[PDB]
Design a protein around this ligand. Sequence first.
Ligand code: CLA
Ligand code: CLA
Ligand code: CLA
Ligand code: CLA
Ligand code: UIX
Ligand code: DD6
Ligand code: SF4
Ligand code: SF4
Lengths: 119, 79, 86, 186, 663, 192
Amino acid sequence: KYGDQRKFAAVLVPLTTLVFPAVAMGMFVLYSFQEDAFWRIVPGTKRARELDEAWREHPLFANSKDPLDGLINPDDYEKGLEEAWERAKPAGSTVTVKDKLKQLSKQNNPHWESWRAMS
Amino acid sequence: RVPGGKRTQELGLVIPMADEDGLTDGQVAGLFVIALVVFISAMDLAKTMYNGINPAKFKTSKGKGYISPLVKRYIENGF
Amino acid sequence: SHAVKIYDTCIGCTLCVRACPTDVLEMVPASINAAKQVASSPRVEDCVGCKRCETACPTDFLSIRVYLQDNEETQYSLGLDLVDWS
Amino acid sequence: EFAGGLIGGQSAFASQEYNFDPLGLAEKFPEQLPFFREAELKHGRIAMLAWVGLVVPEFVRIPGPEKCWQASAVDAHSACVXXXXXXXXXXXXXXXXXXXXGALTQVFIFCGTLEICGTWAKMNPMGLTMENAGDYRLGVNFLPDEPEKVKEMKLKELKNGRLAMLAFGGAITQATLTGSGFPWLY
Amino acid sequence: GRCASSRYLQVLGSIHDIECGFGIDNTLSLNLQIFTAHWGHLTIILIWVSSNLYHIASNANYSLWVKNPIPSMPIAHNIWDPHFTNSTSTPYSHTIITTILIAYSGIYNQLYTSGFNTINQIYKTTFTFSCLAVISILLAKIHINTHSELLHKLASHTSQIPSFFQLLYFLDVAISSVNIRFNFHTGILVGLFSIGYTGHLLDITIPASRAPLIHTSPSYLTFFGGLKSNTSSLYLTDIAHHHLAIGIISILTGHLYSSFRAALGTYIRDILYTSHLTHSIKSLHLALSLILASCTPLTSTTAQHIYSLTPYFYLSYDHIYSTALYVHHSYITSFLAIASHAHTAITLVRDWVAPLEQESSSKQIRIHTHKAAIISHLSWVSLWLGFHTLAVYSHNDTCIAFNSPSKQILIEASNGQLIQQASGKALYGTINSINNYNKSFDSFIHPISPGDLYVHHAIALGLHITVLILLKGGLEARGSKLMPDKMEHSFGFSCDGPGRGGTCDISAWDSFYLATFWMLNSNAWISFYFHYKHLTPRQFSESSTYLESWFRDYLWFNSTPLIHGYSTLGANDLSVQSWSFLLTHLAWASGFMFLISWRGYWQELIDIILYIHLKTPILINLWNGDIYTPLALSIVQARFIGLVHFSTGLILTYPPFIIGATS
Amino acid sequence: XXXXXXXXXXXXXXXXXXXXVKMSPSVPYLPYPERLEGWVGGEKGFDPLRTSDIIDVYWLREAELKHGRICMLATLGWISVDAGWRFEAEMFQGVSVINAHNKMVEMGVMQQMLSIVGVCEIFSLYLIKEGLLGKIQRKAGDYFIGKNFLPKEEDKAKDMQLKELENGRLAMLAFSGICTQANLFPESHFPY
Ligand code: CLA
Ligand code: CLA
Ligand code: CLA
Ligand code: CLA
Ligand SMILES: CC(=O)O[C@H]1CC(C)(C)C(=C=C/C(C)=C/C=C/C(C)=C/C=C/C=C(C)/C=C/C=C(C)/C=C/[C@@]23O[C@]2(C)C[C@@H](O)CC3(C)C)[C@](C)(O)C1
Ligand SMILES: CC1=C(C#C/C(C)=C/C=C/C(C)=C/C=C/C=C(C)/C=C/C=C(C)/C=C/[C@@]23O[C@]2(C)C[C@@H](O)CC3(C)C)C(C)(C)C[C@H](O)C1
Ligand code: SF4
Ligand code: SF4
């Protein structure tokens, strides 16, 4: 008969539109209370820290987060910058290149990514 | 069937139904086996995408990695 | 927690400090303006984000800028009353 | 250096270099000179074999599919391929002939396989240069161990190839115009 | 501290924003995640294709529809719903027989044209496509492993020199390479796919459409025209020849860039550097935007040419297929069109490096230098079109309400008529120079009237305003006069506070949100135009110059069968259509409160409700709210949810009307 | 010179001396594919078409062994059925091997075998992946069967593994000729 496929429907439709959705919702609310929940979008999860440290352990990605990464010979760059600043230093100015860069790198933003203290 | 819409009634459009079954239960089961294979593979893929790449595998995993000889050529051919 | 940053264009109005409803901002001595003072945000963990400080700032573009971070909200940045997160 | 220092450009009166390149393609395309020499040697070899097999069938004809294995050297290509469907496309509906199918497509597929695992394998995978242009390392043990002997043997190969290319062109054109036997004359 | 109830919405709002992932540290991870997601999406597409093929094979009547296609109706799938009447018989079943749904997709004509004759072939096709889904997932796993193996091969990798760190940029050269991708896409994926489909047609489709013929001779490549008389569709020989020509052209074109060897082909970077471009081609958002802007003309022309030149057997004989396909593809291409602009704005926010202030070198730089001129002129043309279309429509409405049809302003559509006349002269010259003439082109050129002119002006107005909103959002995404720091913030953010005049809907995402309403409105105008002209060409030609005709003779008049679907007189097979009609009205109106009412009201309401819960005897001793604190939806989440409700209601309210009016 | 050249950056590369390149022994004009070194047959060094320059050899050796093993059985099956060896049970009177496939799939016994081959191959697919991924300890085409008759001299095993490949390669070309000759000339037998 044209029916006889409803034997499959009477099991599949209740299953996949009631049992599977209910199990999925229960599993989702259970997953919501894991410490790993939404670790890719929610800040301050343990797995995020472990993944970042694992990336940092790779020899290629050691100095990857540094915005100044790339200077093949930073000593040459610093020496050239110091020489160029010496010829342009205003009168009896007492600022050197080294401490100027050191104090231009050190800013005061305590409340930046402070969420790296729980997980 | 109780038709609706002007055109179906004024043209006599009908919807034939096969008196046979279509697919036998064996064929449906054969399709469901491969559907289950897709399902298992998709769950595995979802797990892998959720966890993402593990860079620290070189400290624990065996072997020494491999770059295919064409991948090297593609590396040095440019970008 | 949000991010409240003070820029050099500050002229020591103190209006931003007075407008803050949770004592996030304060006045610190400085030497970059005739008022010899600039604002500071030492307690942005209490910044709800009302942006009243930005409303009160009279510089051409705000010397104080509040950057909203919704995926960062704490109990203080949300103003939770019925519920404690501590 | 002329044409990247390839064998073939030296004159025969000696003390002179023909360095024949009126269009100056050697200096226009120095990065494709190895490919140019590959093509020149391939044309020369194919033309040598083509002239030999343009003369020979006038005397002996292998006894086979009578649809081919018959006629003048001119009516030997379109006859030994038959009315293929479009071009070099086997008729899968009626294999075993009975109307239309090729008789050389076997030569075509053998040449394709050899060419791919020949020139293509020499250039694409893990490399041809100026010196190893036509060198497929086939019968090099027969090549004498002397720096000038190898050079003169390569020059003889090149000049025989050029002569065979011109000769095949003339021979096939005369055969098409006249028919006739080996002289290929009116 | 922990999160509140807004965590779910915050996470799901960027659930696929792989750039915003927290573990992701480099373009290698981003590109590999995107590639694996592509593989999974291709698997989903293949499973969907196999799904449709299975349901046509099992719960359908393809074997009977193929015999008598013109008056017959296809079956989508059976209905198994325990909520129906266990007694009597539903209006969707022939008494005691099972319950069925009529397919309005068009797969029946697709399979019939492609050469399907038997259910067994469809079953084998379903099996093969499920196999292909398995293959796609396994390819995803394979590529994840190969890239992880390259990463592990960096445990045996060093250049013995400080330049070894350069390998960091080439790890994802497999995905990020452009020349190889362009060459192989344009050659293989386009040209050779077309050539393979020509082979399919010549081997199956043309053999399984006529009496037995020669061994697929080159006479199967014809140049007739359109609309074979018997099946009212394009000649399969013409389709095979078209695919062959396109395949040859694209195969030749695919040898352009330097893909596999450095000695052949020109580089895309050098092509752009010597032209009016040189954009940042390494941005993924830029590529996504400009390929979504490519799928948009393709999908729009698909909608136009499935109807104008029907390519499938007996597709024009179905009064519901032709409208449903056109409306579906018009909506798809509108979504892709607005997607292109949205991702252009995201590109400008995220992946665009600009010179200091004055270096007018980049194309985006030159656009941004005079962006005010662009936006002002777009506003001018939008204002002109709106004023002069609404005013002329109002003139016609007023003068036809006042018993004066002859006082209307009816500008004869002379330019479109000239284009149609030129095209018709060309086509007629083509036909007259044929020994097998008397051909037909169906609706390639249609009667153009003043109503057509007014509707085209309305459509141009809608397109202009949608482009205006999207372009303004893109150009001012990095900073406007009101908020000259907008590129320091996210692509989508709530506002900039009530001060400085008030700054609601200031982000570029808010520009997209505003532009989606205009996209929906323009698409509704286009779909109404097509459907009205489809239902009654004569009445549209005469009475469509006044908007009251659109209101009465189309909406009010054609909605009669749908509302009568289920009533206190019995039900029809349109009962689902009417129920979904009302449900989509409810969904459309439900999103008004997410758009009109804003957060603070509801936050106070939620505080009151939470007070109740923390005050109820039993709840307080089990749930103090400290875990998943209920909070009102944030501002951006609220706008997005209201937009989703509005879009769902507006889109899904239409198919019930189409089915009720055409069927 | 195993390396393709000797340099630091591929712009000032110094290509290896022509007489000093390793070179394949099968195709004398091609350099040796170093990716094949270590595997069983990697002494004839035959890989033109460069299909191992792109695909992990673990896959190809898995496919090479499966083809050879399946051809060694198929060649024996065709020879025996052609010489006349129909199974003891009745319903196996297919008269000719060329029509044995369509005859048996009609009877219903091919659907059983396709299932049994299918499950073992799905099990093979799990093995091949985890074998490649370096998770299990499995080589290419090593389904852990036998392993007791495998010679244990660290060189005799190399010969037997090579012997399996050589017989497998011969069977691949043998069965193709066997099947093709059967269709062309329905005279059907191992001698033909
Ligand atoms: C049709 C659109 C629509 C709908 C349905 C609602 C619904 C609601 N509004 Mg609202 N509103 C709207 C438009 C709408 N609004 C617009 C356009 C505005 C203009 C700004 C407002 C402004 C507004 C304000 C200012 C307030 C409301 C309030 C309310 C709520 C009070 C009514 C109630 O609790 O009934 C229940 C809700 C219903 C929708 C009734 C039907 C419920 C269904 C039919 C039964 C359940 C279905 C079943 C479970 C299916 C399960 C789901 C399925 C997935 C399984 C309710 C959630 C008030 C409120 O929240 O105070 C309590 C309030 O203060 N609204
Ligand atoms: C470019 C070379 C070339 C080409 C394209 C052809 C093409 C053709 N020949 Mg022909 N032939 C050739 C060379 C060639 N020949 C040579 C060199 C000889 C002398 C032995 C012959 C002797 C010959 C005869 C006697 C006949 C043909 C015939 C034919 C036609 C039918 C095909 C056939 O069975 O040939 C048969 C050809 C051969 C048996 C000779 C093959 C020699 C090849 C070219 C050498 C192998 C090349 C290989 C790739 C390199 C590695 C080996 C190397 C170390 C030598 C066809 C048009 C038949 C016909 O219909 O004529 C009208 C015919 O009866 N040929
Ligand atoms: C002195 C009056 C004046 C003039 C010369 C212009 C001139 C211009 N306007 Mg404009 N505009 C005006 C008033 C004026 N506007 C007012 C009052 C408004 C507020 C409604 C606007 C709103 C407006 C918009 C929104 C846009 C323009 C645009 C434009 C430019 C294109 C022309 C156009 O769209 O006109 C059409 C003008 C309108 C639709 C506005 C209505 C016209 C008003 C009512 C005229 C008022 C004149 C005034 C009463 C004269 C009093 C004289 C008396 C005191 C002696 C053009 C430079 C467009 C642009 O920038 O493109 C380049 C554009 O998009 N205008
Ligand atoms: C499906 C069959 C198959 C497969 C997968 C392999 C796989 C392999 N072989 Mg192998 N081999 C085979 C059959 C096969 N073999 C046969 C039949 C022979 C006898 C001639 C050999 C002889 C052989 C030698 C002598 C050597 C190998 C080696 C290798 C390894 C590296 C070679 C490579 O990358 O190719 C793998 C990829 C393929 C084989 C794909 C080829 C598919 C192409 C497209 C088909 C072309 C042939 C076609 C049917 C002919 C066209 C007909 C007509 C047009 C003329 C690899 C494990 C080498 C080794 O041991 O390295 C460790 C080695 O030295 N093989
Ligand atoms: C392991 C292994 O194998 O190693 C191999 C390696 C390797 C290298 C492959 C080998 C080789 C060498 C080979 C095979 C060399 C063959 C060389 C041939 C056939 C040369 C033919 C030249 C014909 C010419 C010039 C025709 C000239 C014709 C002319 C000028 C005709 C001139 C006419 O005026 C004449 C005469 C008649 C007029 O009507 C018109 C025309 C036709 C123009 C070995 C030996 O195998 C060993
Ligand atoms: C016909 C036919 C077929 C065919 C064919 C084929 C293969 C046709 C082939 C034709 C072919 C191969 C034609 C070559 C011409 C070569 C020329 C003109 C060389 C000129 C060379 C000249 C003029 C050289 C001049 C110089 O020497 C001068 C004078 C002084 C020297 O110092 C320098 C130079 C070098 C400058 C089909 C299609 C296969 C089947 C069909 O059924 C029948
Ligand atoms: S209101 Fe603005 S300008 Fe005034 S003190 Fe505060 S930050 Fe400085
Ligand atoms: S946003 Fe509000 S709470 Fe935060 S610093 Fe400014 S005024 Fe104070």
